[PDB]
């Protein structure tokens, strides 16, 4: 088996290899990339997502989210307080303010230490889940707004036609902005392009050891766990590398920089944080290998996780038994 230790692999495709998205994904998986739950793809030096980012201030962040933490430094939940709309310009200015800016630090490692030590005592503001794209339409390779859709994949593989669409989202981050421990909706893949700004650090549990993470989470958030059989779908829980190491949870970490893609793989739990002002674009996608993961994916039926229009049809076709009870949580 390739990559038996489930290490995060880093790919350096040539521009020739960068033309066929699906085939390169299959290539990475032939080399065992998926076992880690996360891979890094450095685009060819000739490739550009767009000409410049000169004009992005005028994007509106309709509902910025203030990420308020509770608990201890290594084990905390966050809640998202809705704030008033602001432009990307205003957000960038806020990110650079003294209150919110990245502190002085020696290197990524020192910054990571400060993140995990000090996260809970601050409440950064995240512009997350903004429908849109920053890829130039003339970018033909690895354009997150022009991927084949999950609905089209489901149709090619299983012959069924469903409603739904699948479009990218932008994320505007600042120092300490956090994405909690999760897998994708329906345990899909995700792909994330860091367009500009400061880095994003990622942590990931190998898909084959996902249940160990879940087991630890039930022990760390025992009431959340009683309330919902798939409470990690709420995307609120954080567990530090230290606490994962202490409980024998296998994981890896890696830092994504501006200009780099990350792909999460089916059932690869991930979490992370931003080093400073940045902008990422991400979208879910599927492959033939996804289909069984989609059939086995846990669902939030407590009603917190409250997910997309398009997810209805995935659950209805792949999880027809769950479909009656799941939609009661989604209605
Ligand atoms: O970038 C973020 O804040 C969160 N992104 C993801 O969880 C992802 O791309 O799968
Ligand atoms: Mg603009
Ligand atoms: Ni994700
Ligand atoms: Zn729930």
UniProtKB/Swiss-Prot annotation:
**Binding positions for 2-oxoglutarate?**
126, 192, 200, 235
Which one GO biological process term can you cite for this protein? Answer: positive regulation of double-strand break repair via nonhomologous end joining
Catalytic activity, as annotated: N(6),N(6),N(6)-trimethyl-L-lysyl(9)-[histone H3] + 2 2-oxoglutarate + 2 O2 = N(6)-methyl-L-lysyl(9)-[histone H3] + 2 formaldehyde + 2 succinate + 2 CO2
Q: Does NADP show up as a keyword for this record?
A: no
UniProt similarity note:
Belongs to the JHDM3 histone demethylase family.
Report the function annotation for this chain. Answer: Histone demethylase that specifically demethylates 'Lys-9' of histone H3, thereby playing a central role in histone code. Does not demethylate histone H3 'Lys-4', H3 'Lys-27', H3 'Lys-36' nor H4 'Lys-20'. Demethylates both di- and trimethylated H3 'Lys-9' residue, while it has no activity on monomethylated residues. Demethylation of Lys residue generates formaldehyde and succinate.
Question: In its UniProt entry, what is this protein called?
Answer: Lysine-specific demethylase 4D
């Amino acid at each position: 088996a390739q990559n038996p230790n489930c290490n995060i692999m880093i790919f350096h495709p040539t521009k020739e290899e960068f033309n066929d998205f699906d085939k390169y994904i299959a290539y990475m998986e032939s080399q065992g990339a998926h076992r880690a739950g996360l891979a890094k793809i450095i685009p060819p030096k000739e490739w550009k997502a767009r000409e410049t980012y000169d004009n992005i201030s005028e994007i509106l962040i309709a509902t910025p989210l203030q990420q308020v933490a509770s608990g201890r430094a290594g084990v905390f939940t966050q809640y998202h307080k809705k704030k008033k709309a602001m432009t990307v310009g205003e957000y960038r200015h806020l990110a650079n303010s003294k209150k919110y800016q990245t502190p002085p630090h020696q290197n990524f490692e020192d910054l990571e230490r400060k993140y995990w030590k000090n996260r809970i005592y601050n409440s950064p503001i995240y512009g997350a889940d903004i429908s849109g794209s920053l890829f130039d339409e003339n970018t033909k390779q690895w354009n997150l707004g022009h991927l084949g859709t999950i609905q089209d994949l489901l149709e090619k593989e299983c012959g069924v036609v469903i409603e739904g669409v699948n479009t990218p989202y932008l994320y505007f981050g600042m120092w300490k902005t956090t994405f909690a421990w999760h897998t994708e909706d329906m345990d899909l893949y995700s792909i994330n392009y860091l367009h500009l700004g400061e880095p994003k650090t990622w942590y990931v549990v190998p898909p084959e050891h996902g249940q160990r993470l879940e087991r630890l989470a039930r022990e760390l958030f025992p009431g959340s766990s009683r309330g919902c059989g798939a409470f990690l779908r709420h995307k609120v829980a954080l567990i530090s590398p230290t606490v994962l190491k202490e409980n024998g949870i296998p994981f890896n970490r890696i830092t994504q920089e501006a200009g780099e893609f990350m792909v999460t793989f089916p059932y690869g739990y991930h979490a992370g944080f931003n080093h400073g002002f940045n902008c990422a674009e991400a979208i879910n996608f599927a492959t033939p290998r996804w289909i069984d993961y989609g059939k086995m994916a846990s669902q939030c039926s407590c009603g917190e996780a409250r997910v997309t229009f398009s997810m209805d049809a995935f659950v209805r076709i792949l999880q027809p038994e769950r479909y009656d009870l799941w939609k009661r949580g989604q209605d």
